[PDB]
Amino acid sequence: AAKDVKFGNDAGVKMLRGVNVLADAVKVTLGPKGRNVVLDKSFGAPTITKDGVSVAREIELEDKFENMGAQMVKEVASKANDAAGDGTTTATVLAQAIITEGLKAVAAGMNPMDLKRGIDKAVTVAVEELKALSVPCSDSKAIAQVGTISANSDETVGKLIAEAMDKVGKEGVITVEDGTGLQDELDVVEGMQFDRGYLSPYFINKPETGAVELESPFILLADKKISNIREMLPVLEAVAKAGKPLLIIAEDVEGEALATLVVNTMRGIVKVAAVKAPGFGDRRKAMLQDIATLTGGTVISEEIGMELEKATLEDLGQAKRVVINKDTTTIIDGVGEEAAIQGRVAQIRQQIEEATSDYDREKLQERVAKLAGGVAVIKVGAATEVEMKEKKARVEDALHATRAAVEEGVVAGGGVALIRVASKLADLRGQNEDQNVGIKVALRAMEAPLRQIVLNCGEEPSVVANTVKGGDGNYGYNAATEEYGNMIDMGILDPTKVTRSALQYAASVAGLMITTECMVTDLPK
Amino acid sequence: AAKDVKFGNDAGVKMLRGVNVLADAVKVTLGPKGRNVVLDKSFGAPTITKDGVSVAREIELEDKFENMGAQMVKEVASKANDAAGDGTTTATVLAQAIITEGLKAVAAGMNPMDLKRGIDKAVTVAVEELKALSVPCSDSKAIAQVGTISANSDETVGKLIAEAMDKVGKEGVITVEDGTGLQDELDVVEGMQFDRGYLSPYFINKPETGAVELESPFILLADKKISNIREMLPVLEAVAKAGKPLLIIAEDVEGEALATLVVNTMRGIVKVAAVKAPGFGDRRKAMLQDIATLTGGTVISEEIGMELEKATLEDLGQAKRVVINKDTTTIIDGVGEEAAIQGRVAQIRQQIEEATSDYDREKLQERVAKLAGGVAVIKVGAATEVEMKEKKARVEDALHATRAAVEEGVVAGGGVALIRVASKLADLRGQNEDQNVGIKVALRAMEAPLRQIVLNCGEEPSVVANTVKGGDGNYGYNAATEEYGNMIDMGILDPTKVTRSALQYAASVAGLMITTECMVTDLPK
Ligand SMILES: Nc1ncnc2c1ncn2[C@@H]1O[C@H](COP(=O)(O)OP(=O)(O)OP(=O)(O)O)[C@@H](O)[C@H]1O
Ligand SMILES: [K+]
Ligand SMILES: [Mg+2]
Known part of the structure; x- marks a missing residue:
C-alpha cells in the first residue's frame, strides 16, 4: 500500500517519542520500590503489575512511526529476557538513556557512525571490566540470599529454591x-x-x-x-x-x-x-x-x-x-x-x-x-x-533469577556494579571527538539504573548517585531500607550475566536506532 | 491591547525566519556581481536596485514575530550605515551567519550567555587583528584615487575631494x-x-x-x-x-x-x-x-x-x-x-x-x-x-568613503581581510566549551561575505573559499574578472573602518537575539 516515508530528524523525533512512552511505562516498575502499572483487560478487572515484561507487551502506539520506535526498543527487553531471563527493565532504561543522549548528539551534528562506534567501544571495555569485578553464587547460603532478594525479601522462597x-x-x-x-x-x-x-x-x-x-x-x-x-x-x-x-x-x-x-x-x-x-x-x-x-x-x-x-x-x-x-x-x-x-x-x-x-x-x-x-x-x-x-509467580521469578546467578558470578546489585565500571572508564577515548561523545553517552547511561531505582523510592537520584560514586567497591544504596552500605553484605546481588546482557542488548538496539536515517510505514489509512 | 507572548524555541524559529527573509533579499546584491532586487511602487514602474539599504528599508513581514526578527537585524545595517556609511550588506550577511549558527547551538542545548561571550571575545580579538593588518591614504594623489574609485571611476569627483x-x-x-x-x-x-x-x-x-x-x-x-x-x-x-x-x-x-x-x-x-x-x-x-x-x-x-x-x-x-x-x-x-x-x-x-x-x-x-x-x-x-x-549624490558618497580612507587605513576587499583574520584566531579559546562554540560561530561567520560575493558571481563558494584560505596575505578572488590575485595590486580595498563596523554591529545584534528568551507583540487582530 502507499507508504509514509520519513528522514533524519523527522524520523528521529518520532522514534524518540515512541521509545520514551515505552521506557517510561516500564521503568516505574524497577527495583524494590517499583510502582504499579495498571493494564486494561477487555473483561473483568484491570491487571495490576510491577513486572516490566508484562507492561512492555501491552505497549503499541497510534502514530505509526512512534510505534516503530517502541517496537524496536521492545526488542531489547525480549532479547535480554531470552538470554538471561531477568533484567529486562534494567535493559530498557539503559537503552532509553543511550538512545536519548545519542539522538541529541546526532541532532547536534555529530557523526552517527562514530557515536555508535564510541558506544560500542565503551560497552566492550565495560563488559571486560564487569568480568574483572565479578565474584560466585555456589553455596546454598548464597543461593538462598539471591532467591530471597529475587522474591522481594521473602526468605521463604529463598529457602525453597535452596532446598530444591x-x-x-x-x-x-x-x-x-x-x-x-x-x-x-x-x-x-x-x-x-x-x-x-x-x-x-x-x-x-x-x-x-x-x-x-x-x-x-x-x-x-x-x-x-x-x-x-x-x-x-x-x-x-x-x-x-x-x-x-x-x-x-x-x-x-x-x-x-x-x-x-x-x-x-x-x-x-x-x-x-x-x-x-x-x-x-x-x-x-x-x-x-x-x-x-x-x-x-x-x-x-x-x-x-x-x-x-x-x-x-x-x-x-x-x-x-x-x-x-x-x-x-x-x-x-x-x-x-x-x-x-x-x-x-x-x-x-x-x-x-x-x-x-x-x-x-x-x-x-x-x-x-x-x-x-x-x-x-x-x-x-x-x-x-x-x-x-x-x-x-514470585517463586517462578526468584527461581529464574537464582538459576542465572548460579551460572555466571555475581556483582553488586542496585545498579552499583555499572556505576563502578563507568568510573573505571573515565579515561577511555576513541579515534575522534564524536567517538569520545559516544563513549561518554554510554558511561552516562550506566548510571540510569541506579538513578531510576532511587527515583522510584521517592528519593533524589543525583544525591544518591553522587554519594555512591563517592565511595567505592561494593558501597551502594539499599533502596529497601534507604540506607547506604556494602551491597554484598546486605545481600543485594545481581548475576553478572543479567547485568552484562542488559547492557549489551541495550547498546545493540540503541546503536541501530542512532544509525537509522529513514523510516517507512503504511500510510495511516 | 492583548498580546501574543512566545518563549524560547518558539520565539527563536520565528526570529530566525524573519532574519532569513531580510538577509536573503539583501545579500543577493553584494559585490560586483550583485543581482537586482525589484521593489514595487504604488505608482509607475518598480524600482530595480543593487543597493542593500534600499532593499532593507522595504522589508516588513506579516507574521508579527518574524517581523520583529527582521526589524531587529535591520538595526545592524542602519547602525553600520550611520557609523561608516558603507558595508550595510556585508554587516547583514555577517549578522545572518552568526545568528543562524548561534541559534542552532542554543537549540542544541548550549548556554546562550556563553555563546555570546565567545562571539564577543572573538570579535574583540578580530578587531585588534584587523588593525594590525591595516595599511595609508595621506597624500592628495591617494585621496584623488580613492575618491575616483568611490565615484565610480569619475576622476572629476576625485580631483574635487582632493582639492577640498x-x-x-x-x-x-x-x-x-x-x-x-x-x-x-x-x-x-x-x-x-x-x-x-x-x-x-x-x-x-x-x-x-x-x-x-x-x-x-x-x-x-x-x-x-x-x-x-x-x-x-x-x-x-x-x-x-x-x-x-x-x-x-x-x-x-x-x-x-x-x-x-x-x-x-x-x-x-x-x-x-x-x-x-x-x-x-x-x-x-x-x-x-x-x-x-x-x-x-x-x-x-x-x-x-x-x-x-x-x-x-x-x-x-x-x-x-x-x-x-x-x-x-x-x-x-x-x-x-x-x-x-x-x-x-x-x-x-x-x-x-x-x-x-x-x-x-x-x-x-x-x-x-x-x-x-x-x-x-x-x-x-x-x-x-x-x-x-x-x-x-556621487560626490557625497565618494567624499564619505575618502574621509574614512584618510582616517585608517585600508585592508584587502572581497571579504579576504575577514578570512585572514579568522585564520589567525584558530587557536582562540574561552572559559568553557560553549564559549569555544561561540568563538567558532564567529570565525565561521567571517567567511560569509566572501562566500556570498562568490555565490552572486555564480561560482562555487566552498571552492573559492578553500583556495583563498589556502593562500595568505592579500591573496584573494577578484569577482569582477573571476581571477585570483593580490587584492591590493588589483585595487580591491575596503576601508578598515567599514569592515570593523560591519563586524561589530553584526555581532552586537546577533548577541542580543541569541540571548533573547521571550518576545511580546500585539495579537494579530
Ligand atoms: N534492596 C535493594 N536495593 C537496591 N537495589 C535492589 C534491591 N533489591 C533489588 N535491587 C535491584 O533491583 C534491580 C532489579 O529490579 P527488577 O526486578 O524490578 O527489574 P529487572 O530485573 O531489571 O527487570 P524485570 O522486569 O525483568 O525484573 C537489580 O538492579 C537489583 O539488584
Ligand atoms: K519489578
Ligand atoms: Mg527482575
Missing part, C-alpha cells in the same frame, strides 16, 4: 506447581532427569510452559544417530497401536528423520518427541543403559548388530510421565523393576570403589545419585487461591 | 551643495564649522540630506538660553522684512521658544533654525565671539545688560550660506571683515603664547584653526537639474 537445588543439584531440573493448600511441598520425581531438551520446538504440546509432556509413553533407547525414517517405520507403527506416545532417546535425530517426526506429530499422526542421549563418548552408552534399567527398556546399539527395524514394543522402555524443556528431560516413574534398578546401583557403586581417578569417580557418583537426575517439584503454599497463584 | 581636502585639511569640514549650473565650485566660508546640530528636525528643509540649508541668512548670537518667544518677537519681525532667513545660535533654545519656531517656520512664517552654541562654560562665550567676528555680528549677552528686544538687524551676523546636520553646523562665507577676523586670530595667537596649560593651549589652537578653519563647500556641476542631483 540441594536435592537435584544447582544444574538439575526444577519446576513449580500450584500447591495442595497452605504449606509448601518439595518432592523429587522421575525417576531421573538429564540435561537434554527437545530436538526442536513443535514437540512442545504445552506452550504455557514451553515444554513437552507425555503420559505413559514408550521410550526408544537407540545408541546411534537416526537419519532415515525407514528404520523407525516398524517401531513407530507398533507404537501407533496401544495408543501411546513415543519418546526417542537416540545419540541424535538428524534432519531427515527429525523433519518427518515434526510433521507427523504435527498432524496428530502418532505423538513422538526426540532428545539426544545424555553425555558423550563412552559414558554416553553407560548412561543410556541406566535409562533402560530405569524404564525397563532395551538399548538398541549397532555394536551388537541390532536393528531398529527388528525392534518390538517389548524392547521399548516405559514410564508414567516424561517432561522435556528447552534443555532438560525428566522421566517420571519408570516401569523398570526395583530389582534391576537397585542392582544396577550396586554395580555402579562398586565402579566407584575401583575408581582410580577422581573424574571417573565424580561421573559415577553422578549416575548413582540420578538412578537412586529426576525433577524436583516445588508446590507453592496457599491459604486462598489468589495468594497461592501470586506466591507461585 | 587641500583647502581645509583632510581633517577639515567639507560640504556639498547643489551647483549654480554647469562647472563645479569650491569655496571656503566662515567660514567655520562647529559640532552642534539642529535643535530639532522639521528645520530640515532638505530631507534628501536630512539637513537644514539657509542662504544669505541673518545670524543671532545670543549668549544665554531662550525660553520666552517675547524676546525674539522684535528681532524676528526685523528679520521678517529684508526677506532673509534667521539662524539662532544661543546657549540653547528651550521648549516654549523652540516649539514656536518649529510651528512658525512650519507655516512659511519666516525661515528660522536654532542650534546650541559650541562648547560649554567659559570657552563657550569666547567661541560664540569667534562666530561674531566671522559673521560680523554682535553677541547679545545679559552679562553686559543687553536685551534681545533691543536688538536690530545691525547686531545680527550674516553669511552667504549655512548648513546644519543632526550634529554639525557649518557657516560658509561670513560677512565679517578680514581686518576684524585676522585681528581676532592674532589675539588668540598670543593666547597660545601665554598658555600655561596644554589643555588651554589645545583649545586655543582649535579656535585659530577654525577661524583661520572654516568650511569648504563643494557645489556640484550641472547641465540639467537631474544630472546635477545625481553627481551630487
